[PDB]
Ligand binder design. Structure first.
Ligand code: K
Ligand code: K
Ligand code: MG
Ligand code: MG
Ligand code: MG
Ligand code: MG
Ligand code: MG
Ligand code: MG
Ligand code: MG
Ligand code: MG
Ligand code: MG
Ligand code: MG
Ligand code: MG
Ligand code: MG
Ligand code: MG
Ligand code: MG
Ligand code: MG
Ligand code: MG
Ligand code: MG
Ligand code: MG
Ligand code: MG
Ligand code: MG
Ligand code: MG
Ligand code: NA
Ligand code: NA
Ligand code: ZN
Lengths: 208, 85, 103, 218, 129, 72, 33
RNA sequence: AGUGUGGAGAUCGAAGAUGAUUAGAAACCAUUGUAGUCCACACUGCAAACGAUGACACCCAUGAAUUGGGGAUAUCUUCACGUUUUCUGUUUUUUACGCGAAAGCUUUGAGGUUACAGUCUCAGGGGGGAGUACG
RNA sequence: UGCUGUUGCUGUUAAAGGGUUCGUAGUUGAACUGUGGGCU
């Protein structure tokens, strides 16, 4: 995560990333709690909606980036999404980072049926929502594939290994989260390491 | 050092299965749900130095849904992840 | 072979000993009150065609003042409930669906 | 001529994986039977048909019959596999089961009764396996005892490479479909028991498909 | 009612190990229970443990490493002569290479391997492996 | 949950087994004189007799035959 | 339905038949003595 | 349900009567109706008297509810009600390990068992003859 | 023949928990009086 071998505070919140999270309300729950996700909840606001810890949420995000950047072949990592809102974001994410992606309905047997064409063997899987993408998660459990997920307050963490707590529901929050994730892996890799803000605008990630 | 040795001094074990860091159970040959994760080490400048650390998680822990919780504890022990603010 | 977990009534194991029976609304068979199929119905006295004939001939009933209705609580034995299509046999997967309010 | 369709298959073809232990070490699934034939020497892989019997399904005009066959493979040196398939003709079922057994290879751990002199000759602890109502229990035995078991479990234990063991069965052992699988499950548990010899900690290596990722890309 | 404090404590520990917990709380405590834990601790099967005083039968919190497979009590406490050690090892132990049977003797509480060296018999308490 | 286990409970266990052994058909037949009194041989393995007449006994279904027997 | 296949007639009526048989034997022995 | 002695006797109703239906119908349907059905005192001791699951004690994952008592801190009426969060005791429901021949069970076990031991007690040992015969 | 079961059986539906309580022989029964110390 943020802590490194040297001890520098380079990979920390800079009070500017925090402003973006609050602007796109990427810290709002859905008035429902799971026993797994209770640790990421800091308090409850009015109308029953719970909010999410920002330090906890940001810390998990950097850990996920250090795993994606750890692998060397972007085409290996597959990004899937079933909700139509996240369809545009994973496309813009994939092109900048170079990873394979797939939206819409998940064809059963994609990871298990070797005879079929379009048989794929990724090494890391990334999903937008564990509940809607349960089919892909379930298949991943049969072929030794770790997964990374964007999990809301009521999320089932059955086969999830690294969960990023966020607001996976809502057009604005999905686009922001993928933009930040794409930016972080790039500076980790070695490009765009300049302190200047990233040239790419977050509007290209929003569903239209 | 690990395994079964006869009195002649040779090792007579076929192989040594992995021992999980979180559950301390042996990971069998037909688990198919156990995974390994590699996390990159980043230098002070802010880029990776070309080395990673590896973790192993047994399959049954991922069935109960506790795999995420185990990862959090391990990373803190290795100093990869901070706590509080 | 046990077919239902609640055995077809609403009497858990350590809740009660006996519930007083009632007469079927249709045939008169005695059934425990917690087992019989109960419905509360509200029926109009006249259908739409007859209601408009009566209303025009009345100095009392009209747009402002509605006409009265009948209120009944009906309880059936299982055989009569099935024969009158109040309930029907359901596939094994669907047997656990329950409704709490009139739909 | 066999062209692999899986990443593991290409590595075996490309001579980057040399034995079955590396596959067992990382618990990777095996999906092509040519992998096993390559990594096991030519003379070190025997097989035998254990049981064939017909099953029937009632139809509107009589009934239709199929045949179910059980097959066992092993090197008599710590590897064992079991497969069972069904087919419309006996010849098809026998062939299909041979492929199936090859895909279910597991390692078997062997130990010593008392003094640790020579090669291991028996299982290292008591172990039991259950399938249906049939359960099989295996007990370590002294040298020269032999295999004290019913004819069906005795054959399976020989292919695994154990020499001395006491045995006992429970349940309806005449159901040989369950009896065969119960013996297989008992042997499979020998590598899951944490023993004081295995208490020492170790550092995890990198997965072979991760090690040769650049080669697999090309 | 609770008839055996030792049997209650050992079942609690075995259940926690099977579920993979890191600590377990035990109540009520007894001097026999403490002696049994020290035997397991000496051979490395459990970690550090701690006794809490409450002016009654106390409580124990024990730390578990992952090495314990099973522990249990033997009831009733049968008598065991020096010639019966092989019989009990053959019946309740997984193998002749590891595992222990705990006895209470006039020399104290000890495992069967030490008792044989001292040439003494006693009564069987339990086992662990 | 099904057995007494106490250290000084040998009398209960002894009387329990003695009572339940009468439910075993083989054991009871061995320790009761009813079977021997009704057995024509009286416990022997062979016996001698005098032939009274020849008779024919029909087989049971689904077989069909006349089985040649003798009354002694 | 509600029940599994019986041996002969309905067991409740078989029990009633036996109960009347015992009554007749009781009368017969009282008459003799 | 049945028995004895006093009461009571509206309703319903074993036995019985009379109409139908039917090849026949002693039955199902219709009109009736005795004993009963209700009360007091005295007997009888049987039920699919069922959760077809003996009693006491320990451990044990999750989410909504519900009945009674108590502790802490925005709503209505003029002390009650109701909000949120804890807690002890009760009857339950939904979606975990584990178990089982399966159906299924699961803090309310049928789990913690061939890796077989917390305590006490009742019953079973192929199907009939038979819960019959004798005492 | 773990189909007499102390080691070592079964009792929701296959055979089998007594209709419910009280209760005498009998079997079973919570914790505690206790870390010896000093020398090379
Ligand atoms: K209350
Ligand atoms: K309350
Ligand atoms: Mg009650
Ligand atoms: Mg009742
Ligand atoms: Mg009902
Ligand atoms: Mg039917
Ligand atoms: Mg039926
Ligand atoms: Mg029956
Ligand atoms: Mg009367
Ligand atoms: Mg009277
Ligand atoms: Mg009448
Ligand atoms: Mg009538
Ligand atoms: Mg007529
Ligand atoms: Mg019932
Ligand atoms: Mg009963
Ligand atoms: Mg109450
Ligand atoms: Mg429940
Ligand atoms: Mg037992
Ligand atoms: Mg024997
Ligand atoms: Mg039996
Ligand atoms: Mg029965
Ligand atoms: Mg009962
Ligand atoms: Mg005591
Ligand atoms: Na009018
Ligand atoms: Na009357
Ligand atoms: Zn009716």
């Amino acid at each position: 995560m943020s802590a490194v071998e040297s001890g520098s505070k380079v990979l920390r919140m800079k009070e500017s990333d925090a402003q973006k999270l609050l602007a796109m309300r990427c810290h709002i729950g859905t008035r429902n709690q799971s026993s797994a996700m209770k640790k990421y909840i800091y308090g409850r606001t009015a109308e029953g909606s719970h909010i999410i810890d920002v330090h906890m949420m940001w810390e998990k995000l950097i850990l996920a980036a250090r795993v994606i950047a750890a692998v060397e072949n972007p085409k290996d990592v597959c990004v899937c999404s079933s909700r139509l809102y996240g369809t545009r974001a994973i496309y813009k994410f994939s092109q900048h980072v170079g990873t394979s992606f797939h939206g819409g309905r998940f064809i059963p047997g994609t990871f298990t049926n070797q005879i079929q064409k379009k048989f794929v063997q990724p090494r890391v899987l990334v999903v937008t929502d564990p509940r809607t993408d349960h089919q892909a998660i379930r298949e991943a459990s049969l072929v030794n594939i770790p997964v990374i997920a964007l999990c809301d307050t009521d999320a089932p963490l059955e086969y999830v290994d690294i969960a990023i707590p966020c607001n996976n529901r809502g057009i604005k929050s999905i686009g922001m989260m993928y933009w930040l994730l794409a930016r972080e892996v790039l500076r980790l890799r070695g490009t765009i390491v300049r302190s200047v803000p990233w040239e790419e605008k977050v509007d290209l990630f929003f569903y239209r | 050092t690990i395994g079964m040795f006869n009195e002649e001094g040779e090792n007579v074990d076929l192989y040594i299965p992995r021992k999980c860091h979180a559950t301390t159970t042996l990971i069998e040959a037909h688990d198919h749900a156990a995974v390994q994760i590699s996390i990159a080490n980043v230098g002070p400048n802010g880029v990776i130095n070309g080395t990673t650390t590896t973790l192993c998680i047994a399959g049954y822990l991922r069935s109960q849904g506790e795999s995420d919780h185990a990862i959090n504890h391990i990373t803190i022990d290795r100093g990869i992840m901070r706590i509080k603010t | 072979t046990t077919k239902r977990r609640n055995h077809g009534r609403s009497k858990p194991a350590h809740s009660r000993g006996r519930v007083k029976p009632i007469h079927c609304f249709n045939c008169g068979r005695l059934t425990p009150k917690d087992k019989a199929v109960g419905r509360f119905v509200v029926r109009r006295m006249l259908d739409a065609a007859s209601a408009r004939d009566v209303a025009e001939a009345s100095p009392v009933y009209g747009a402002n003042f509605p006409m009265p209705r009948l209120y009944m609580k009906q309880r059936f034995c299982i055989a009569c409930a099935i024969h009158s299509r109040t309930v029907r046999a359901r596939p094994v997967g669907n047997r656990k669906i329950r409704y709490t309010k009139k739909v | 001529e066999w062209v692999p369709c899986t990443k593991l298959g290409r590595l075996v073809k490309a001579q980057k994986v040399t034995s079955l232990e590396e596959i067992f070490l990382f618990s990777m699934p095996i999906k092509e039977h040519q992998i096993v034939d390559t990594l096991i020497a030519e003379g070190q892989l025997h097989d035998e048909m254990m049981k064939i019997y017909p099953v029937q399904k009632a139809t509107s005009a009589g009934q239709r019959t199929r045949f179910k066959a059980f097959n066992v493979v092993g090197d008599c040196d710590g590897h064992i596999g079991i497969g069972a398939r069904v087919g419309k003709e006996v010849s098809l079922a026998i062939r299909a089961s041979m492929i199936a057994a090859k895909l279910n290879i597991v390692p078997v751990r062997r130990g010593y009764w008392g003094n640790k002199i020579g090669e291991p000759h028996t299982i290292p602890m008591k172990v039991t396996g259950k399938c249906g109502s049939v359960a099989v229990r295996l007990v370590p035995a002294p040298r020269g005892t032999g295999i004290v078991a019913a004819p069906v479990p005795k054959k399976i234990l020989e292919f695994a490479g154990v020499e001395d063991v006491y045995t006992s069965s429970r349940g309806k052992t005449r159901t040989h479909g369950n009896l065969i699988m119960a013996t297989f499950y008992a042997l499979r548990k020998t590598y899951g028991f944490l023993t004081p010899d295995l208490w020492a900690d170790t550092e995890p290596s990198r997965d072979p498909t991760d090690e040769h990722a650049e080669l697999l890309a090309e | 009612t609770m008839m055996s404090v030792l049997a209650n404590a050992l079942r609690t520990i075995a259940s926690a190990e099977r579920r993979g917990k890191r600590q377990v709380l035990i109540r009520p405590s007894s001097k026999v229970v403490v002696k049994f834990l020290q035997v397991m601790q000496k051979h490395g099967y459990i970690g550090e443990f701690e006794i809490i005083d409450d002016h009654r039968a106390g409580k124990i919190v024990v730390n578990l490493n992952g090495r314990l497979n099973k522990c249990g009590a033997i009831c009733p406490r049968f008598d065991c002569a020096t010639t019966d050690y092989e019989k009990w090892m053959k019946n309740i132990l997984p193998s002749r290479q590891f595992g222990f049977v705990v006895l209470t003797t006039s020399l104290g509480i000890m495992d069967h391997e030490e008792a044989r060296s001292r040439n003494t018999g006693g009564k069987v308490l339990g086992f662990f492996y | 949950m099904t057995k007494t286990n106490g250290q000084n409970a040998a009398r209960k266990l002894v009387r329990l087994r003695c009572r339940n052994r009468w439910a075993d058909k083989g054991w009871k037949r061995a320790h009761t004189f009813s079977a021997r009194k009704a057995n024509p041989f009286g416990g022997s393995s062979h016996a001698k007799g005098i032939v009274l007449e020849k008779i024919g006994v029909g087989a049971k279904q689904p077989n069909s035959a006349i089985r040649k027997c003798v009354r002694v | 339905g509600t029940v599994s296949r019986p041996r002969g007639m309905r067991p409740k009526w078989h029990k009633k038949r036996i109960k009347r048989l015992k009554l007749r034997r009781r009368r017969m022995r009282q008459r003799s003595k």
